[PDB]
Amino acid sequence: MAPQKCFLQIKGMTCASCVSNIERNLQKEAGVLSVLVALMAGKAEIKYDPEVIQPLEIAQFIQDLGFEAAVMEDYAGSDGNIELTITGMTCASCVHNIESKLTRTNGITYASVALATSKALVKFDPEIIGPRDIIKIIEEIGFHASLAQ
The missing domain is CATH 3.30.70.100 (Alpha-Beta Plaits)
Structure with a gap:
């Protein structure tokens, strides 16, 4: 496809495994099929596909799961x-x-x-x-x- 990387941060982080669940969920959302979360530093870099999935849809997924997803600013590049x-x-x-x-x-x-x-x-x-x-x-x-x- 045309894989686009998105640079966001999470706010929430229950700690032990909720991020880990979230990763698996996003891998099954839609055009997104790469998760790169550093739970340590607290960043979610992923690779979505803008023609199929949109960042606000992602946000809806995260909001449903019960976290905040907020882009750093750098929504892609x-x-x-x-x-x-x-x-x-x-x-x-x-x-x-x-x-x-x-x-x-x-x-x-x-x-x-x-x-x-x-x-x-x-x-x-x-x-x-x-x-x-x-x-x-x-x-x-x-x-x-x-x-x-």
Whole structure:
């Protein structure tokens, strides 16, 4: 398939085995078939399939099971749905301009640039355009967009 990794954290953690049950449950949810929870550090990295399963559906599963699933921020950074850290920018106008540049691209359907965090989410079709062109565009401005990942 096109496996996309999702970076989230759990809040709950009964301790002994509830995470362990949760892992098995998610392996049977739908398009997700990799669990990478570090119960030690307290992170759930997994690999879902966005065209079949969606993060909020996941959340519903976790909520039903009786935990909180909250993404770190980094909901993926993967295929179509990438994210970038934009360095050099330091003004709302620069944000607006970047977002204009992005939206100017045929494929990109929603961008969301968040300066307080200093990353940008980008939602395009990974065939008609590619990240390097976006990079080039912002290089032409004079920013640096590095996949924060």
